[PDB]
């Protein structure tokens, strides 16, 4: 019933969380230059079909994510959105598309994806290139808050539960530093996440990349190791 933790979950498990009605969070685990590291994900329900966000960073943890749903949930995955390029959020996505789910990101990411040698979501979605842009898609709204965690992350809102997923550009209460900024703009974040704080006011749950859910304190919390991590 707890939030399962990075070392309660073995490298190619897959486990889901209920958020709230028809909100599941994803939580997988994979090795990075040599370090083991948790990964959250988004579910959330369309009617009698599924919308996934992000992958369960790699081949194998996402065809067990797939799995997953299907033994805890039993409807279909039909569309996938990656949050941004790196593979936490799009490494899997050819697993997804080759079990029929259909894959997005901002153009920007594709981008970003392909220049890098990641894998690459099918779609692009338009409508989200100025911070401050939110597009509606299915039981989402996705809102890009400016550069932070890397310059093409994308946040998702599930309006009809107020959860706030904030992907890598939010951190967990307990973090020391901005985790891995290898694309990061530390001087902007504060001000792409002031934006995500102005624009979900009512949020009441926050969900981070990496790490536990709690409330709006995410945000604040992660300006400021941004901050001082700069
Ligand atoms: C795939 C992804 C990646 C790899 C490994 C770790 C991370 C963490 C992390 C670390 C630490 C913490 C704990 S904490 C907050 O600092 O206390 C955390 F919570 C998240 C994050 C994140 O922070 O989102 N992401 C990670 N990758 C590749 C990559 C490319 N690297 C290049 N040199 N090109 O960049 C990147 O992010
Ligand atoms: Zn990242
Ligand atoms: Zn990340």
């Given at each position: 019933?707890?939030?399962?933790?990075?070392?309660?979950?073995?490298?190619?498990?897959?486990?889901?969380?209920?958020?709230?009605?028809?909100?599941?969070?994803?939580?997988?685990?994979?090795?990075?230059?040599?370090?083991?590291?948790?990964?959250?994900?988004?579910?959330?329900?369309?009617?009698?079909?599924?919308?996934?966000i992000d992958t369960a960073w790699g081949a194998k943890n996402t065809a067990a994510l797939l799995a997953e749903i299907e033994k805890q949930i039993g409807?279909?995955?039909?569309?996938?959105?990656?949050?941004?390029?790196?593979?936490?959020?799009?490494?899997?996505?050819?697993?997804?598309?080759?079990?029929?789910?259909?894959?997005?990101?901002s153009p920007s990411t594709?981008?970003?994806?392909?220049?890098?040698?990641?894998?690459?979501?099918?779609?692009?979605?338009?409508?989200?290139?100025?911070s401050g842009d939110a597009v509606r898609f299915g039981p989402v709204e996705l809102f890009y808050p400016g550069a932070a965690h890397?310059?093409?992350?994308?946040?998702?809102?599930?309006?009809?539960?107020?959860?706030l997923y904030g992907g890598c550009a939010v951190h967990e209460l307990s973090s020391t530093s901005a985790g891995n900024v290898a694309d990061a703009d530390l001087?902007?974040?504060?001000?792409?996440?002031?934006?995500?704080?102005?624009?979900?006011?009512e949020a009441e749950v926050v969900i981070p990349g990496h790490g536990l859910p709690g409330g709006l304190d995410l945000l604040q919390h992660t300006a400021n190791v941004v901050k001082a991590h700069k």
């Amino acid at each position: 019933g707890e939030y399962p933790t990075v070392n309660e979950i073995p490298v190619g498990e897959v486990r889901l969380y209920q958020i709230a009605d028809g909100v599941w969070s994803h939580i997988a685990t994979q090795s990075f230059d040599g370090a083991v590291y948790p990964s959250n994900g988004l579910i959330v329900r369309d009617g009698d079909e599924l919308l996934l966000i992000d992958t369960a960073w790699g081949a194998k943890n996402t065809a067990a994510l797939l799995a997953e749903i299907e033994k805890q949930i039993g409807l279909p995955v039909t569309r996938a959105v990656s949050t941004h390029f790196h593979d936490d959020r799009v490494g899997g996505v050819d697993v997804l598309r080759a079990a029929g789910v259909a894959t997005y990101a901002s153009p920007s990411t594709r981008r970003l994806a392909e220049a890098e040698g990641n894998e690459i979501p099918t779609h692009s979605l338009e409508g989200l290139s100025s911070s401050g842009d939110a597009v509606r898609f299915g039981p989402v709204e996705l809102f890009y808050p400016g550069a932070a965690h890397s310059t093409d992350n994308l946040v998702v809102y599930v309006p009809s539960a107020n959860v706030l997923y904030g992907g890598c550009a939010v951190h967990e209460l307990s973090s020391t530093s901005a985790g891995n900024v290898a694309d990061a703009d530390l001087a902007e974040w504060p001000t792409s996440v002031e934006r995500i704080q102005k624009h979900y006011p009512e949020a009441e749950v926050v969900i981070p990349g990496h790490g536990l859910p709690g409330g709006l304190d995410l945000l604040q919390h992660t300006a400021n190791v941004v901050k001082a991590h700069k």
